[PDB]
Structure 1
Amino acid sequence: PLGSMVATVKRTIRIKTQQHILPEVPPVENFPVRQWSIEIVLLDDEGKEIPATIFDKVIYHLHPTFANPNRTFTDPPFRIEEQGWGGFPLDISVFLLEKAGERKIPHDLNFLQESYEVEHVIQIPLNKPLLTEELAKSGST
């Protein structure tokens, strides 16, 4: 990194998606309606999943066809459950502890697998004591 970005650490997030058809919901234009879920975990320096306590809030910014498309969750693993008929790209806003910053994590909600996981690297500052202490749980700081 350069400049102010030197004072950061990288962490890997894993976005975990699951989906299945709901037969009791009438297909929309012959397309089945599916229940789907997204959860977010943190990986440590060994690759083990641990609670993503470095975020005090996650907002899923859903496709505009959803009612109340901006859904806020405050407790790991920030699980969202919805229903729909089509996949879409979405930004997941994760808010670091101590107002350290919003990160927009690009996700794609799709039906290509019953469940699938995607890892994303984010850069996190080291100037908020409580966040730094929390970061120690998932690796070097």
Structure 2
Amino acid sequence: LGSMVATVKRTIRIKTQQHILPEVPPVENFPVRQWSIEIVLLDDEGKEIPATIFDKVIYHLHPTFANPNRTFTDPPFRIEEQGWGGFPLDISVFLLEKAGERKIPHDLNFLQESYEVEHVIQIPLNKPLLTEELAKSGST
């Protein structure tokens, strides 16, 4: 375990919603949908709170999107787009104080109108400002 001993775990929740845009012509008879993704943090009780432990989130979209790497700096880091197909994507989340990048695997899909996915990430405890922020969401 070594250096990994000096971390805490937190659960983040990725929230996705999508709906068809009828005013947009289907692509090969596939409807174009508006979709959104946001990110929240869970506390030790499972309540959603702002994910302020990240100072940046970058969505790395399918290369069929114009400038597919979309950067957000303010919680809940909400991205909105239009598209005709689902796809796996990586979400890069950057911890405060350059504590590290985490890549979170997401799948953007049209199986439900809205769906939530939880991911556990390990966060270091060596950056004072990040450690203070972490206290808001649970034990450290």
- Paired with 2:107 and 2:134, the residues of 1 have a C-alpha distance of 27
- Give the secondary-structure state (helix, strand or coil) at the position aligned to 2:51: coil
- Per the TM alignment, residue 23 of structure 1 is displaced from its structure 2 partner at its CA by 0.1
- Paired with 2:111 and 2:101, the residues of 1 have a C-alpha distance of 29
- Paired with 2:103 and 2:115, the residues of 1 have a C-alpha distance of 20
State TM-score, norm by structure 2. Answer: 1.00
State TM-score, norm by structure 1. Answer: 0.99
- Paired with 1:12 and 1:89, the residues of 2 have a C-alpha distance of 20
- Per the TM alignment, residue 110 of structure 1 is displaced from its structure 2 partner at its CA by 0.2
- Paired with 2:110 and 2:44, the residues of 1 have a C-alpha distance of 30
- Paired with 1:5 and 1:58, the residues of 2 have a C-alpha distance of 23
- Per the TM alignment, residue 45 of structure 1 is displaced from its structure 2 partner at its CA by 0.1
Q: What value does the CA root-mean-square deviation take over the aligned residues? A: 0.2
Structure 1 runs (4+) deviating above 2 angstroms are: none
- Per the TM alignment, residue 92 of structure 1 is displaced from its structure 2 partner at its CA by 0.0
- Per the TM alignment, residue 120 of structure 1 is displaced from its structure 2 partner at its CA by 0.1
- Paired with 1:112 and 1:76, the residues of 2 have a C-alpha distance of 26
1:124 aligned partner: 123
| Unpaired segments ≥5 residues, structure 1 | none
* Percent of aligned pairs sharing the same letter: 100
- Paired with 1:27 and 1:46, the residues of 2 have a C-alpha distance of 43
- Per the TM alignment, residue 16 of structure 1 is displaced from its structure 2 partner at its CA by 0.1
- Give the secondary-structure state (helix, strand or coil) at the position aligned to 2:4: helix
Give a deviation string over 1:103-140, Cα, whole Å, max 9, x none: 00000000000000000000000000000000000000
Give a deviation string over 1:35-70, Cα, whole Å, max 9, x none: 000000000000000000000000000000000100
- Paired with 1:106 and 1:137, the residues of 2 have a C-alpha distance of 25
- Paired with 1:11 and 1:63, the residues of 2 have a C-alpha distance of 27
- Per the TM alignment, residue 20 of structure 1 is displaced from its structure 2 partner at its CA by 0.0
- Per the TM alignment, residue 96 of structure 1 is displaced from its structure 2 partner at its CA by 0.1
- Per the TM alignment, residue 93 of structure 1 is displaced from its structure 2 partner at its CA by 0.1
